[PDB]
Write an enzyme that holds these catalytic residues in place. Structure first.
Site, mmCIF file in Angstrom:
data_model
loop_
_atom_site.group_PDB
_atom_site.id
_atom_site.type_symbol
_atom_site.label_atom_id
_atom_site.label_comp_id
_atom_site.label_asym_id
_atom_site.label_seq_id
_atom_site.Cartn_x
_atom_site.Cartn_y
_atom_site.Cartn_z
ATOM 1 N N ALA A 19 17.671 18.743 90.073
ATOM 2 C CA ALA A 19 18.686 19.039 91.298
ATOM 3 C C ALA A 19 19.303 20.442 91.232
ATOM 4 O O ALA A 19 19.054 21.137 90.137
ATOM 5 C CB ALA A 19 19.575 17.859 91.359
ATOM 6 N N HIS A 188 13.806 19.160 80.477
ATOM 7 C CA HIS A 188 14.464 19.590 81.684
ATOM 8 C C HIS A 188 13.674 19.649 82.793
ATOM 9 O O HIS A 188 13.919 20.546 83.699
ATOM 10 C CB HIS A 188 15.376 20.597 81.543
ATOM 11 N N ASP A 193 10.884 14.807 81.001
ATOM 12 C CA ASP A 193 11.866 13.847 80.421
ATOM 13 C C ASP A 193 11.657 12.558 80.778
ATOM 14 O O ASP A 193 12.023 11.659 79.839
ATOM 15 C CB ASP A 193 13.146 14.372 81.242
#
Ligand SMILES: O=c1ccn([C@@H]2O[C@H](COP(=O)(O)O)[C@@H](O)[C@H]2O)c(=O)[nH]1
Lengths: 228, 224
Positions: A19, A188, A193
């Site tokens: 995000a 990340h 991930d």
């Protein structure tokens, strides 16, 4: 006579998102990955033996969705540095916003999975799940997750490592390196991930499934990170 | 003067299935990896010997699904793909059905147009088989405005100068002088194909622009 709250989960869906920033910035999703694994595929994993055990082989049968999403606001400097994504670049590559068609896509992916289904996300209870709830709340469709359950893998792995505690980090990378004595890859990024999380959850699959069954809660009960 | 303009999205595609064409096979796995034109144009150009294997663009959309067939895989198919009807069923996989078409349509809708499928041997296997599977559904095909090309033809043109095997693995090793190490899955084959297509990315895009044809013209592998 003691029973599970929602039955045995037949699918685990490993989830991560990226995000634009940390929660107080009212962030927007820029990347989402789901990796759906059937219970039987998880419990088929070869037993972990030796110290360190080998990193588990991902099951042959998996369903995967990974999407980049144009946000309506800029990524923080720190967010773009960590994730490798920026609003500018997502726009030049014509990525669409988080919209009704994305909810329809997500629903159709979830509908291919045997139920009950449980999302599994590292720090999901404080970040991924509230943020997804917020994004979905903006749309005109029903929530595509309304019959799906969810759990946070931080609590799960704290429990599992206790069975095998203070100022041990339960970051995703910390756990992976503790279990496998190697660094994870593609940190990340949403898919990288998710794959690291799958490997951690394949360490002790039966124990992980028992904990998930006992702690699964409806996604519909997750409070949005922020409101309109 | 290109036939259908510049392709804005390339969708690297691989299908696994129950057998060879005369067996009237059914799809058991599908992977789509959608890459914007600019993400390929941004691939670094090595100009060294050997060139390093490119890494995938940061911005990609990916879909990989396992699909229960209605007929058994041949022994050869199960050996090569690692899939079987029985195991797909015990893991509750669904058939190639209307909900899968909803999913494919929604995924395609997120890609800028014009969009071109790219598959290795797609002209003789993946594209006709996909056409057959979609034709069985009530839903109009989600691919009738999409274009397609075969990457065997692409790499034959990119390696020509102005005996060679054109198996995926042979091409990768000839370009990069190392063995591929993707999994033997639909997604692994798509990632290997992407790497091959990133060897000369501008040239690949030019060949695709010049040779894109409408998926609506692909003849089904077999009919009802
Ligand atoms: O120092 C940090 C750490 C995390 N994040 C935000 O946390 C999101 C999810 O964290 P993760 O999945 O990368 O661990 C990231 O996409 C990013 O926006 C930051 O902004 N700064």
């Amino acid at each position: 006579s003691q029973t599970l709250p929602h039955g045995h989960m037949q699918t685990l869906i490993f989830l991560d998102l990226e995000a634009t920033g940390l929660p107080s910035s009212r962030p927007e999703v820029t990347e989402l990955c789901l990796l759906a694994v059937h219970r039987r595929a998880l419990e088929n994993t070869s037993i972990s033996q030796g110290h360190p055990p080998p990193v588990p082989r991902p099951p042959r049968v998996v369903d995967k969705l990974s999407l980049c999403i144009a946000p309506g606001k800029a990524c923080s400097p720190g967010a773009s540095e960590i994730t490798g994504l920026s609003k500018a670049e997502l726009e030049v590559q014509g990525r669409q916003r988080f919209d009704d068609n994305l909810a329809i896509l997500l629903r159709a992916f979830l509908q291919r999975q045997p139920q009950p289904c449980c999302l599994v996300a590292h720090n999901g209870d404080r970040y991924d799940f509230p943020l997804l709830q917020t994004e979905l709340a903006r749309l005109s469709t029903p929530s595509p997750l309304d019959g799906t359950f969810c759990v946070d893998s931080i609590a799960a792995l704290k429990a599992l490592e206790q069975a095998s505690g203070s100022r041990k980090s339960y970051s995703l990378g910390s756990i992976y390196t503790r279990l496998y004595w190697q660094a994870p890859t593609d940190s990340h990024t949403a898919e990288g991930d998710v794959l690291t999380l799958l490997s951690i959850c394949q360490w002790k699959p039966q124990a992980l499934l028992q904990w998930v069954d006992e702690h699964a809660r409806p996604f519909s009960t997750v409070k949005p990170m922020y409101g309109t």
